A paper describes a structure:
NQO1 is a quinone detoxifying flavoenzyme that catalyzes the two-electron reduction of quinones to hydroquinones. NQO1 exists as a homodimer with two tightly-associated flavin adenine dinucleotide (FAD) cofactors that reside at the deepest point of each active site of two monomers of 274 residues. The two active sites reside at opposite ends of the dimer and incorporate residues from each monomer.
Crystals of hNQO1-FAD (holo-hNQO1) belong to space group P21 and diffract to 2.0 Å resolution. The asymmetric unit contains two dimers. We observe unexplained Fo-Fc density in the active site which does not belong to any of the possible ingredients of protein purification and/or crystallization. When we try to model benzoic acid in this density, it refines to partial occupancy (0.5). The crystal structure shows excellent stereochemistry with 96 % of residues in the most favored region of Ramachandran plot.
Residue numbers in the entry:
A (entry chain A): 0 to 272
B (entry chain C): -3 to 272
Amino acid sequence: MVGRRALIVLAHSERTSFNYAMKEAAAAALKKKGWEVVESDLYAMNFNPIISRKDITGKLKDPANFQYPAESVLAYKEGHLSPDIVAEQKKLEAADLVIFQFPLQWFGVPAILKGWFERVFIGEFAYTYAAMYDKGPFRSKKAVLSITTGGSGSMYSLQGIHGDMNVILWPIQSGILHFCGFQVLEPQLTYSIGHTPADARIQILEGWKKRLENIWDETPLYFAPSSLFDLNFQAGFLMKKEVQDEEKNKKFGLSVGHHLGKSIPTDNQIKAR
Amino acid sequence: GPHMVGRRALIVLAHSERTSFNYAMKEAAAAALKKKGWEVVESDLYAMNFNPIISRKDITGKLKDPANFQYPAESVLAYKEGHLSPDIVAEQKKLEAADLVIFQFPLQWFGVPAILKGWFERVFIGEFAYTYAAMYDKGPFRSKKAVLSITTGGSGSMYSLQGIHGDMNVILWPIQSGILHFCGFQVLEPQLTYSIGHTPADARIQILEGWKKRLENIWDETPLYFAPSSLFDLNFQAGFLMKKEVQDEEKNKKFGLSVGHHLGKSIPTDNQIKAR
Ligand SMILES: Cc1cc2nc3c(=O)[nH]c(=O)nc-3n(C[C@H](O)[C@H](O)[C@H](O)COP(=O)(O)OP(=O)(O)OC[C@H]3O[C@@H](n4cnc5c(N)ncnc54)[C@H](O)[C@@H]3O)c2cc1C
Ligand SMILES: Cc1cc2nc3c(=O)[nH]c(=O)nc-3n(C[C@H](O)[C@H](O)[C@H](O)COP(=O)(O)OP(=O)(O)OC[C@H]3O[C@@H](n4cnc5c(N)ncnc54)[C@H](O)[C@@H]3O)c2cc1C
């Protein structure tokens, strides 16, 4: 009910960027509230984002038919993961709150951050088909995305040329974060930061600092509870028969991905209900 | 269907293993197109040991503003001056030549592998791949066709409307619309190979044969539906919003236009998976 440890993952090469200023603003605001703040500035760490056989520090189980998921899980169980992955996994294990600070790039996370998820979020460590989504290993943790874009807010509105931002956010927030157990908080969306005058930029930094004063007390984003599904291969991980019947009486879909051919609830991936 | 002899294909592969089904699919695609007279070029990102990280090392000469580095403006300027790193230039020349672009990858964390995401970031430079002046429909790759050939760990049912992962059409949207279509590409129906780890040996053989059979007449296919850019007022003053007349015509519709342009309505079935 009180958050004490935070991890800030930053994905920007420039110490001069607004992204770096947002990482500094976050670290300062949380430290003032008594949090222990740990950082993963991917570029300053020269983080290797590419999965490979070298992520296993020893012999492989089946090198003739190398399969990264089974091999990396085995290396995790045996303590044979590459020390750079182990150090990141320790940061995650200690954190209550995880902040991801990054510029939106090609409607997703920068490649360096994509590879950080790929090499760090190893099976059993971060996810398991035995405890999916709300039952996941990171269920006691909270995650938040703080994103800057080149495009304006209107471009990402329902009627905007790029389409709904809620759709762009879904694969990261549900698929990457929520699948691992994280309760996902409302994203900090900083639109067209390149076309924002100096006065407003100072205020964006202060607004983010003020939000972080009570971040742990916020209501997280709504995702469909895992209890609504038959979480086993035989049923095909499909929504329960009774839930399918009950949902026929629902006007809106449960979320973006669980729209069910119905209207998506307004800002399902942007605002808590 | 119509002959494509001498036409050009680029296969971008994102898998390190020669023994992978992804590599098998790349080989099947190259053999099928070559049999139809296509000129086939590949970008095996792991074999190339492709640098996937955007940095100032992507520009060879002097920068416009080295104390305040901004990748978009610096990379565009480098493209205009022909000062992009040679590895980027070699990939941009492969794309320029290609009529058809196949992206062969295993689905990783509900998107493209980091190496392929890095390829998009370093290769798809402004002016070369996109402009705010000619977004989406009018984009530089409007004469080209792109196709995703994806393999997944999860079954088809996990990615169905009622599946635990949610609708696959939503996962596909940021790649197909945001990356490919924004650049002008006509996007073809994705080749989706679900739970390839659970597929029996005879079924895996027939997935390869089915892919080869599809590539025999791929250029003749109807592309996926995206809302035309002509429905929007493409400028800052209008905020790149749908035209008033389009908004009025949409009020009594039950269905939205696409995944991204769902407009608070019902998404048409398989908008990112099946063409109309
Ligand atoms: C590969 C690539 C792909 C992209 N794809 C997309 C896409 O899909 N969608 C999209 O919308 N955009 C896209 N973009 C644009 C991108 O999201 C923006 O360029 C980015 O968000 C800008 O954020 P920044 O941190 O780099 O800011 P900067 O450009 O570095 O900074 C913005 C301003 O803030 C100022 N600033 C810095 N520090 C401070 C401080 N302490 N206090 C106040 N002001 C400060 C700077 O001086 C500058 O004036 C893409 C960019 C790249 C490189
Ligand atoms: C970091 C990471 C994240 C992931 N995230 C996700 C996710 O978000 N969603 C998801 O659903 N999955 C996810 N996965 C799973 C991933 O999509 C699968 O592991 C992958 O698609 C398997 O395809 P492959 O090419 O590696 O095949 P392999 O596992 O290498 O092989 C599959 C089968 O094909 C056989 N085969 C190979 N060549 C031939 C041939 N010529 N003819 C016939 N059979 C052949 C093999 O022997 C094997 O039986 C993730 C995996 C990783 C590494």
